Design a binder for this molecule. Structure first.
Ligand SMILES: *[C@H](CC(=O)O)[C@H](C)[C@@H](O)/C=C/C(=C\[C@H](C)C/C=C/C(C)=C/[C@@H](C)C(=O)[C@@H](C)[C@H](O)[C@@H](C)C/C(C)=C/C(=O)O)CC
Ligand SMILES: Nc1nc2c(ncn2[C@@H]2O[C@H](COP(=O)(O)OP(=O)(O)NP(=O)(O)O)[C@@H](O)[C@H]2O)c(=O)[nH]1
Ligand SMILES: [Cl-]
Ligand SMILES: [Cl-]
Ligand SMILES: [Cl-]
Ligand SMILES: [Cl-]
Ligand SMILES: [Mg+2]
Lengths: 1017, 121, 209
């Protein structure tokens, strides 16, 4: 209402009203705040709004108002600066400088308005990016002079130089042209001598000042780029590593500077520099020990307490120590006078590694890995660190995270339960811990064993018993598999198991039993080498796992199945052969009793179990025996199947039964499971069910269609219809799985393909959109991938059946039918790669849709689609080029060459497709190079459009200049011309070409971009 | 909740029907508990979100309520609730509650109806 | 009351608004409706140290919908930086968001969040995620969809702002609910309203639950 008034500019700006609106937005709530927000955004966005900027800065009694005023200028400076008349530029500079000077002189404003002053500085720095130093040569000298006049101004200058260094060196790559970035870096470089001088003097004439802190803040930025001599040839390392370490308000920033120093480009063979690098570390460690905490201090406890800035400091210390040592520890390793330092630093790291903070722990673990990996290889180094490593072994063993395989966890009520979900975020952490622990074991296998065995004893006797302690220990024991000799491993593992069993014998109740079960399972699963040598033991282990498959505790049960397959993946050979003193291969035993064993399992566990059997059976290389085993394995699912097939054939109604649908689905899934592990070997079992299975696919398809007709689209949501579709989907999955692994491609084509296409294509094409399975598309991709070359008429059939109907599902927006969308483009891609002829056969109208489809894919933000769209495009171009000077190639170029060029430019230049930049650039380069290399045999221009002689090169430039000129009317002709010259010349050098593109993207975001920037080389 | 007996507990996911939009929206995942007040003998549904422990359902299992099936699910019930106080002020919702299994859905219904009888007395 | 300004920043489509909504109402918004400038929401948590109120300033990640941009950060007392682990560019831009944030808010606790870990094809590897170390940001893998670690950013921030590392979320007491009888009049409409509900399919019928 009243609020909106400020948007009317024909009226003079009521500043008071502005402040009300601003305060409403910042301190208000609900509807009022919301309306103010919209208002303020509109005000800000108004392109004249900057003209009100001085008025606001002068008269507002509200800092957020002026902040917003500054955001308005910032927008103007960064985007429209060079469009402004010269006097508005002078005037803007002047009132920005003046406001800064003015705010720095009044100590109250200086003290309590930091946000507004920081904004002002940043705004100033934006002006410097535009105007400095070419149109503002004296700014650095005058900043240096002004500094000595006032403590407030001097400090604020440090803020300004920090911001400038940031904008020039840290954040220029994305935001400036290559030429302008170089100009500014060069400019800063040429005058840094004097900048440093000021920085050093200030640092020498103060101890614990906001000015000192500010100066050091700026120094942290400079260290990213300054020459090393400024650091090593002045007294600055001494000051940083002593004086600035002692006061806590300077200590934080100094330690970060010192970390950065530990990364300077530094001569390798200079003994004096080496000494300086030792000295600052030595100084720094000394200040820690005497000013902060001794090496013995409980950092775990300190961090946990979280006083003041303790967490941050400890974090920054870890970062300093790990950084320095990773680069420099060798400087400390040979000289005995430096041994204590080296070990003390590492002792701090040991204490740091005890802290309970996962992210911090990963930082130190990275360091430990760097250390141990080096000690594993570098001669004569490991003995130095023997005591550190010994402590580290303890730390890692006591902080082992739960492996992904250990499926039981303790809930908030002290109960051992199955996990609700995967601990997805501890996967990389476990791998990291294992890696380090594995190296430590190699480094001293006696120490590692003694530690684990003795920890185990303190579990047995009760002294240290607890779920946590037994767990972390068990996990560690399992994680070192492969580090010991078979012999040591033998004894080791024997002891561990005896002890874990004895331990289980002692404990009672379901929770205890679950825990010890999970730990035993994890350990045995981790030592296949042992299992392979101990048949009796192995057999007994598997039988116990089978017992667990009847467990009422679900976590244990589930873990038993996973453990079973994990063991089988490694030891299958010992299940397929007949072992001494055994009357049959164990696989025979497993199969004979399969109904009993899996009786209490959930269906997917049953499938896993069948998958494991498949692994074993595939070990049998005698074809007769293997097929017989496969037959025996599939006895139950095949007998269920046979009976079902009779019923379906008799009448389609019985399939209607929900129970029957579930039975069928589980039969197919079982087949999928076994096919997954047996691959090529699965063929005879596939052949048993195949014809009836495709018949069933049809019958079930009719049911779905009938249900939709009778109940509406909503039928697709029903349990019944989802169950019927599951059948279809599993059938598709089974065929896909087999075909993806098939070794006899002739049989695929001669036996499998024709009935499959006949069964699936028309059904897909002739269903309503919501009833079409995306899996059909996925199945067809594999079919084309594997036998595409052998079935040209088949590929044509696939296109005909799925192309236009699928495109029409996905071409109204970017979101609907996400699965179809993804699978559609994967199918198009493989077809384009393997059976391009199929696209040649398309009627010209359908070929146009194909080109539309490809460009449509470009415009997706979805990476799965976008990436494929760009690849198809590149591949297509290649396919065309390959045809040579023939009419189809010529027509293609005449029709589509410029469509591809402009579409590629569109997604390059719209800021909404940044993820695809690389592949976009590759495509654009290919397209341009086709013309540059005269690889297009016909004029790209229609006659009389241009003179007859005219080259495609000239015409391409002309088309592009015109395109860009209309699409970006704020560019000058010379910018466009210069851009195109550069781009076309660089069409053979992808890295340069890409840089020229990025420069263009910078320039289109502002006015008055320098055309000579495209000359950068 | 110290003045209450836990009759039934089951892990669940609760939806509320947005009518203006034509969609179900999740309200919470967690333990759905049936709680009998030791003083009044009244039986309520109380359900809290995992981790934040925020109340996502709090209402008497009124004798008038009827658990109806949802068209999409064999493991869910839908019913109209006239006075849920989870958010604060007493408020009417159309609720849907889905379970890990059909067994759980069937068990819930049974217990719900037993509770309704207790609530009648 | 004990309330804190929280600013939530990061690239478009990273899951910022969905994340907040999840906490606000429990719902999972499947649709992507770009935030226009900023959306301010009150969010209360119950803790063993009493209630803590966040005023969550859920900002626009798309440049073209950016509105006041860094103007939103003024006097923020904490922040969450969001990226999408299935989109590398979103991680690449993390330093940019951080930069603009800390220029305005010099000393606040900040959580870095890698969202959408529910999605199988992860692009930003766990090992790659190190930007937070030198900047003293807390990091969590999260999913607004699966609720993986969804409470962690707020729990950590609450600990840091209240200054108590042993702070926990606690169960709010649950008032006796009323004894209401459905009134004669609306009983007719309740049948219509219920009907629409029964015949509208519940979402994600394939989830565990
Ligand atoms: C609790 C039991 C209890 O209530 O006390 C636990 C959780 C158990 O239920 C779980 C046990 C599991 C596996 C066991 C390790 C399987 C048993 C194997 C076994 C007894 C094998 C025999 C044949 C041996 O070889 C025995 C005699 C031998 O001493 C073994 C243990 C050591 C070896 C191999 C010595 C050698 O020299 O070869 C859950 C999977
Ligand atoms: N798979 C998955 N999708 C998610 C997750 N979180 C959000 N999304 C989805 O990602 C899309 C974008 O979410 P939204 O919250 O709008 O993102 P935003 O960061 O607020 N975008 P903007 O900055 O433009 O306002 C939505 O479709 C949403 O459903 C997640 O954890 N997993
Ligand atoms: Cl301000
Ligand atoms: Cl020098
Ligand atoms: Cl083997
Ligand atoms: Cl010009
Ligand atoms: Mg949003």
């Amino acid at each position: 209402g009243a609020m909106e008034g400020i948007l009317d500019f024909s009226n003079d700006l009521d500043i008071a009203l502005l402040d009300q609106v601003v305060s409403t937005f910042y301190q208000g709530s609900g509807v009022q705040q919301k309306q103010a927000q919209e208002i303020l955004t509109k005000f800000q966005d108004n392109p004249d709004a900057w003209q009100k900027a001085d008025q606001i800065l002068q008269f507002s009694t509200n800092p957020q108002s002026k902040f917003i005023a500054l955001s308005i200028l910032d927008k103007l400076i960064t985007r429209k600066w060079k469009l402004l008349p010269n006097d508005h530029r002078i005037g803007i500079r002047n009132f920005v400088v003046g406001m800064i000077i003015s705010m720095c002189q009044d100590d109250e404003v200086f003290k309590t308005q930091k946000n507004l002053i920081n904004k002002s500085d940043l705004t100033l720095v934006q002006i410097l990016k535009q105007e400095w130093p070419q149109n503002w040569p004296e700014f650095i000298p005058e900043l240096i002079g002004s500094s000595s006049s006032s403590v407030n101004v001097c400090e604020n200058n440090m803020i300004v130089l920090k911001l400038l260094s940031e904008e020039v060196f840290d954040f220029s790559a994305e935001q400036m042209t290559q030429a302008k970035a170089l100009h500014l870096k060069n400019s800063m470089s040429k005058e840094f001598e004097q900048i440093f001088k000021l920085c050093f003097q200030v640092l020498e004439q103060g101890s614990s000042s906001s000015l000192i802190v500010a100066t050091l803040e700026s120094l942290l930025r400079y260290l990213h780029w300054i020459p090393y001599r400024y650091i090593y040839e002045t007294n600055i390392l001494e000051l940083l590593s002593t004086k600035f370490m002692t006061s806590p308000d300077t200590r934080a920033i100094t330690l970060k500077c010192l970390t950065e120093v530990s990364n300077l480009k530094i001569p390798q063979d200079n003994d004096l520099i080496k000494r300086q690098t030792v000295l600052f570390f030595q100084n720094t460690l000394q200040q820690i020990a005497t000013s902060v905490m001794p090496v013995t201090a409980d950092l775990k406890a300190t961090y946990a307490n979280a006083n003041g800035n303790d967490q941050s400091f400890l974090q920054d210390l870890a970062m300093f120590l790990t950084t320095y040592l990773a680069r420099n520890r060798a400087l400390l390793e040979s000289d005995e006078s430096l041994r204590e330092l080296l070990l003390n630093a590492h002792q701090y790291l040991i204490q740091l590694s005890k802290i309970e903070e996962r992210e911090l722990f990963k930082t130190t673990l990275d360091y430990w890995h760097n250390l141990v990996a080096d000690l594993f290889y570098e001669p004569l180094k490991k003995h130095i660190y023997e005591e550190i490593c010994s402590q580290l072994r303890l730390v890692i063993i006591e902080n082992m995270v739960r492996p992904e395989e250990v499926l039981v966890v303790e809930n908030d009520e002290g109960e051992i339960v199955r996990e609700f979900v995967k601990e997805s975020d501890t996967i990389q952490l476990y791998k990291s811990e294992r890696e380090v622990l594995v190296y430590l074991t190699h480094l001293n296998v006696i120490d590692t064993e003694e530690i684990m065995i003795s920890k185990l004893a303190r579990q047995i006797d009760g002294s240290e018993w607890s779920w946590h302690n037994i767990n972390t220990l068990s996990w560690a024991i399992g994680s070192i598999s492969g580090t010991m000799s078979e012999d040591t491993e033998k004894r080791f593992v024997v002891t561990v198991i005896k002890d874990l069993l004895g331990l289980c014998e002692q404990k009672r109740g379901k929770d205890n039993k679950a825990v010890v079960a999970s730990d035993i399972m994890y350990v045995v699963g981790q030592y296949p080498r042992f299992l392979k040598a101990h048949w009796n033991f192995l057999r007994t282990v598997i039988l116990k796992l089978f017992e667990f498959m009847h467990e009422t505790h679900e976590g244990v049960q589930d873990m038993a199945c996973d453990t079973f397959i994990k063991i089988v993946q490694k030891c299958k050979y010992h299940f397929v052969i007949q072992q001494p003193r055994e009357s049959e291969p164990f696989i025979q035993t497993i199969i004979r009793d399969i109904q009993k064993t899996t009786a209490d399992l959930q269906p997917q566990q049953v499938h896993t179990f069948y998958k494991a059997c498949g692994i074993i059976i595939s070990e049998e290389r005698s074809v007769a025996e293997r097929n017989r085993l496969l037959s025996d394995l599939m006895q139950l699912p095949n007998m269920a199947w046979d009976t079902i097939v009779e019923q379906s054939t008799a009448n389609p109604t019985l399939l209607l039964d929900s129970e029957t649908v579930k039975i069928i689905a589980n039969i197919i899934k079982t087949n999928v499971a076994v096919c997954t592990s047996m691959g090529a070997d699965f063929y005879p079992q596939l052949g048993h069910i195949y014809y009836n299975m495709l018949q069933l696919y049809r019958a079930v398809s009719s049911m779905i269609s009938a249900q939709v007709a009778a109940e509406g689209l909503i039928a697709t949501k029903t349990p019944k219809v989802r169950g019927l579709r599951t059948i279809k989907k599993e059938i598709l999955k089974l065929v896909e799985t087999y075909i993806s692994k098939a070794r006899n491609l002739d049989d695929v084509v001669k036996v499998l393909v024709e009935p499959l296409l006949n069964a699936v294509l028309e059904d897909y094409m002739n269903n309503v959109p919501d009833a079409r399975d995306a899996e059909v598309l996925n199945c067809m991709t594999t079919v084309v991938e594997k036998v595409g070359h052998m079935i040209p008429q088949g590929v044509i059939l696939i296109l005909q059946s799925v192309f236009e109907c699928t495109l029409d599902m996905i071409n109204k927006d970017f979101t609907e039918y996400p699965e179809h969308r993804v699978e559609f483009y994967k199918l198009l891609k493989v077809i384009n790669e393997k059976s391009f002829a199929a696209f040649l056969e398309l009627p010209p109208a359908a070929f146009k849709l194909f080109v539309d489809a490809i460009c449509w894919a470009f415009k997706h933000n979805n990476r799965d689609v976008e990436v494929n769209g760009l690849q198809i495009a590149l591949d297509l171009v290649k396919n065309i080029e390959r045809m040579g000077n023939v009419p189809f190639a010529n027509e293609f170029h005449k029709n589509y060459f410029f469509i591809f060029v402009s579409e590629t430019f569109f997604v390059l230049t719209d800021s909404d497709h940044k993820s695809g930049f690389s592949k976009q650039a590759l495509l654009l380069m290919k397209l341009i190079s086709l013309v540059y290399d005269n690889k297009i045999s016909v004029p790209l221009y229609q006659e009389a459009e241009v003179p007859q002689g005219t080259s495609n090169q000239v015409y391409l430039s002309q088309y592009l200049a015109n395109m860009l000129s209309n699409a970006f009317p704020h560019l000058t002709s010379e910018q466009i011309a210069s851009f195109l010259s550069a781009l076309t010349k660089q069409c053979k050098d992808l890295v340069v070409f890409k840089g020229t593109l990025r420069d263009f993207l910078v320039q289109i975001k502002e006015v008055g971009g320098d055309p000579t920037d495209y000359l950068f080389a | 909740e110290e003045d209450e007996e836990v009759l039934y507990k089951v892990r669940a996911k609760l939806f509320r029907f947005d009518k203006d939009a034509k969609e179900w929206k999740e309200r919470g995942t967690g333990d759905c508990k049936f709680l009998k007040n030791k003083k009044t003998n009244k039986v309520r549904i109380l359900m809290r979100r995992d981790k934040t422990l925020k109340i996502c359902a709090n209402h008497i299992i009124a004798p008038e309520y009827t658990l109806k099936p949802n068209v999409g699910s064999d493991r869910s019930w839908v019913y109209a609730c006239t006075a849920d106080i989870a958010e604060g002020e007493a408020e009417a919702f159309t609720f849907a509650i889905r379970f890990g299994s059909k067994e759980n859905a069937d068990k819930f219904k049974e217990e719900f109806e037993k509770a309704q009888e207790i609530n009648k007395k | 009351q004990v309330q804190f300004k929280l600013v939530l920043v990061g690239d478009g489509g990273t899951g910022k608004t969905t994340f907040v909504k999840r906490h606000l109402t429990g719902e999972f918004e499947k649709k992507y409706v770009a935030t226009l400038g900023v959306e301010v929401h009150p969010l209360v948590f119950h803790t063993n140290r009493g209630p803590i109120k966040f005023n969550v300033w859920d900002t626009a990640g798309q440049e073209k919908f950016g509105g006041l941009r860094d103007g939103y950060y003024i006097q923020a007392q904490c922040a969450i930086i969001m990226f999408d682990v299935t989109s590398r560019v979103t991680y690449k831009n993390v330093p940019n968001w951080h930069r603009d944030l800390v220029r305005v808010c010099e000393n606040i606790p900040i959580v870095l969040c890698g969202n959408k870990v529910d999605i199988k094809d992860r692009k930003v590897k766990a090992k790659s995620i190190v930007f937070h170390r030198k900047k003293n940001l807390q990091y969590y893998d999260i999913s607004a969809k699966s609720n993986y670690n969804f409470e962690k950013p707020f729990l950590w921030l609450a600990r840091k702002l209240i200054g108590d590392p042993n702070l926990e979320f606690v169960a709010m007491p649950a008032l006796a609910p009323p004894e209401v009888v459905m009134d004669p009049a609306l009983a007719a409409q309740y049948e219509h309203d219920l009907e629409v509900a029964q015949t509208t399919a519940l979402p994600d019928e394939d989830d565990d639950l």
